Amino acid sequence: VNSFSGYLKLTDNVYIKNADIVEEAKKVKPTVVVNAANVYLKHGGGVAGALNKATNNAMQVESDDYIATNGPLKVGGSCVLSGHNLAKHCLHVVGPNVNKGEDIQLLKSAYENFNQHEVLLAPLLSAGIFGADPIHSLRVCVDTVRTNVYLAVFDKNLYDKLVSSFL
Ligand SMILES: O=C(O)c1cccc(Cl)c1
């Protein structure tokens, strides 16, 4: 049993809810929240901007030190940093950004990072401002992640379309 409430069950391991991911993290304090990161960990907008704002910019300060030491992530890659006031840990995952021309086949590699964690609160990778089709992102999620994932969909309209169209 876990703390997640109000989710629709899609599969054995994947759950979905219409929710602001910043508000869900604050309520649950999950072990892992996933950030929709870029390779520079520049948390300017979208999920990243919202998560970072909720940490009062402490996520960005920590991230800048990580990049200064390690250099940029890979598209499809990830790193584990603090969850600050939102979670124990933040898994920063880089899905491909279609608005930068990145290979959508890297979306599966991105989701494979989730398999290193038994339970996660996450957004749909490469969705929102990243430019990919969220229906496709949900399909890749279900067909890639084997650990227990609780997906937070920001738009109510999109949430209802993802559920209604789910095979
Ligand atoms: O695209 C999203 O899921 C998103 C974008 C910005 C803020 C939030 Cl809470 C969510």
mmCIF file of N, CA, C and O and ligand atoms in Angstrom, residues 19-23 36 45-51 123-124 127-130 152-155 158, ligand 1:
data_model
loop_
_atom_site.group_PDB
_atom_site.id
_atom_site.type_symbol
_atom_site.label_atom_id
_atom_site.label_comp_id
_atom_site.label_asym_id
_atom_site.label_seq_id
_atom_site.Cartn_x
_atom_site.Cartn_y
_atom_site.Cartn_z
ATOM 1 N N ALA A 19 -3.695 16.260 -12.293
ATOM 2 C CA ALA A 19 -3.186 16.973 -11.101
ATOM 3 C C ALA A 19 -1.997 17.862 -11.455
ATOM 4 O O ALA A 19 -1.290 17.571 -12.447
ATOM 5 N N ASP A 20 -1.845 18.933 -10.676
ATOM 6 C CA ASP A 20 -0.640 19.791 -10.753
ATOM 7 C C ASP A 20 0.445 18.981 -10.034
ATOM 8 O O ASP A 20 0.255 18.661 -8.857
ATOM 9 N N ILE A 21 1.541 18.666 -10.723
ATOM 10 C CA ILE A 21 2.636 17.810 -10.167
ATOM 11 C C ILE A 21 3.318 18.480 -8.962
ATOM 12 O O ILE A 21 3.771 17.748 -8.074
ATOM 13 N N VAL A 22 3.361 19.816 -8.932
ATOM 14 C CA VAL A 22 3.945 20.577 -7.786
ATOM 15 C C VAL A 22 3.083 20.355 -6.526
ATOM 16 O O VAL A 22 3.660 20.220 -5.443
ATOM 17 N N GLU A 23 1.752 20.264 -6.670
ATOM 18 C CA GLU A 23 0.779 20.134 -5.555
ATOM 19 C C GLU A 23 0.746 18.670 -5.125
ATOM 20 O O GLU A 23 0.703 18.388 -3.929
ATOM 21 N N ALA A 36 11.020 16.789 -15.689
ATOM 22 C CA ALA A 36 11.173 16.913 -17.150
ATOM 23 C C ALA A 36 12.335 17.846 -17.452
ATOM 24 O O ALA A 36 12.149 19.023 -17.760
ATOM 25 N N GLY A 45 11.068 26.578 -17.606
ATOM 26 C CA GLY A 45 9.619 26.578 -17.776
ATOM 27 C C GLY A 45 9.121 25.170 -17.738
ATOM 28 O O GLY A 45 9.898 24.243 -17.418
ATOM 29 N N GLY A 46 7.825 25.022 -17.988
ATOM 30 C CA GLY A 46 7.178 23.703 -17.926
ATOM 31 C C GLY A 46 7.255 23.091 -16.536
ATOM 32 O O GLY A 46 7.329 23.811 -15.509
ATOM 33 N N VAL A 47 7.234 21.763 -16.507
ATOM 34 C CA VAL A 47 7.318 21.014 -15.224
ATOM 35 C C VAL A 47 8.571 21.470 -14.464
ATOM 36 O O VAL A 47 8.443 21.755 -13.272
ATOM 37 N N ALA A 48 9.721 21.536 -15.145
ATOM 38 C CA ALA A 48 11.014 21.929 -14.535
ATOM 39 C C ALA A 48 10.894 23.311 -13.906
ATOM 40 O O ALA A 48 11.373 23.486 -12.770
ATOM 41 N N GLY A 49 10.364 24.270 -14.665
ATOM 42 C CA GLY A 49 10.235 25.612 -14.080
ATOM 43 C C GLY A 49 9.333 25.609 -12.884
ATOM 44 O O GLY A 49 9.574 26.363 -11.908
ATOM 45 N N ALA A 50 8.238 24.857 -12.935
ATOM 46 C CA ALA A 50 7.273 24.825 -11.825
ATOM 47 C C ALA A 50 7.880 24.126 -10.614
ATOM 48 O O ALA A 50 7.743 24.611 -9.485
ATOM 49 N N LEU A 51 8.510 22.974 -10.824
ATOM 50 C CA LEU A 51 9.168 22.276 -9.681
ATOM 51 C C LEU A 51 10.229 23.185 -9.053
ATOM 52 O O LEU A 51 10.281 23.307 -7.819
ATOM 53 N N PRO A 123 5.755 13.168 -14.596
ATOM 54 C CA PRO A 123 4.994 13.681 -15.727
ATOM 55 C C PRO A 123 5.229 12.785 -16.924
ATOM 56 O O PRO A 123 6.120 11.930 -16.927
ATOM 57 N N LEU A 124 4.425 12.950 -17.954
ATOM 58 C CA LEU A 124 4.680 12.323 -19.230
ATOM 59 C C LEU A 124 5.906 12.926 -19.897
ATOM 60 O O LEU A 124 5.938 14.142 -20.238
ATOM 61 N N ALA A 127 6.353 15.358 -23.245
ATOM 62 C CA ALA A 127 5.028 15.997 -23.454
ATOM 63 C C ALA A 127 5.084 17.478 -23.022
ATOM 64 O O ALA A 127 6.184 17.988 -22.742
ATOM 65 N N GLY A 128 3.942 18.171 -22.983
ATOM 66 C CA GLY A 128 3.953 19.603 -22.623
ATOM 67 C C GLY A 128 4.823 20.404 -23.584
ATOM 68 O O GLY A 128 4.775 20.140 -24.791
ATOM 69 N N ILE A 129 5.711 21.259 -23.055
ATOM 70 C CA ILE A 129 6.584 22.153 -23.894
ATOM 71 C C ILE A 129 7.712 21.410 -24.634
ATOM 72 O O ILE A 129 8.363 22.052 -25.506
ATOM 73 N N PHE A 130 7.932 20.122 -24.331
ATOM 74 C CA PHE A 130 8.951 19.290 -25.024
ATOM 75 C C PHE A 130 8.505 18.946 -26.455
ATOM 76 O O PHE A 130 9.363 18.481 -27.204
ATOM 77 N N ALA A 152 1.171 12.305 -13.384
ATOM 78 C CA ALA A 152 0.479 13.597 -13.147
ATOM 79 C C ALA A 152 0.290 14.331 -14.483
ATOM 80 O O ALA A 152 1.295 14.737 -15.096
ATOM 81 N N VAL A 153 -0.963 14.467 -14.930
ATOM 82 C CA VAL A 153 -1.272 15.173 -16.212
ATOM 83 C C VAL A 153 -1.832 16.562 -15.881
ATOM 84 O O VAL A 153 -2.911 16.644 -15.252
ATOM 85 N N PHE A 154 -1.129 17.607 -16.316
ATOM 86 C CA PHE A 154 -1.511 19.002 -15.972
ATOM 87 C C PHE A 154 -2.866 19.432 -16.552
ATOM 88 O O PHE A 154 -3.657 20.032 -15.805
ATOM 89 N N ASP A 155 -3.105 19.171 -17.832
ATOM 90 C CA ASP A 155 -4.364 19.618 -18.482
ATOM 91 C C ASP A 155 -5.503 18.614 -18.268
ATOM 92 O O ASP A 155 -5.311 17.434 -18.587
ATOM 93 N N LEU A 158 -6.484 17.168 -21.651
ATOM 94 C CA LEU A 158 -5.533 16.135 -22.098
ATOM 95 C C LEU A 158 -5.705 14.857 -21.264
ATOM 96 O O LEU A 158 -5.660 13.819 -21.850
HETATM 97 O O1 LIG B 1 3.226 20.357 -18.910
HETATM 98 C C1 LIG B 1 3.065 20.163 -17.673
HETATM 99 O O2 LIG B 1 2.735 19.046 -17.192
HETATM 100 C C2 LIG B 1 3.304 21.307 -16.704
HETATM 101 C C3 LIG B 1 3.860 22.487 -17.141
HETATM 102 C C4 LIG B 1 4.097 23.517 -16.247
HETATM 103 C C5 LIG B 1 3.756 23.367 -14.917
HETATM 104 C C6 LIG B 1 3.178 22.186 -14.496
HETATM 105 CL CL1 LIG B 1 2.709 21.922 -12.782
HETATM 106 C C7 LIG B 1 2.974 21.158 -15.383
#
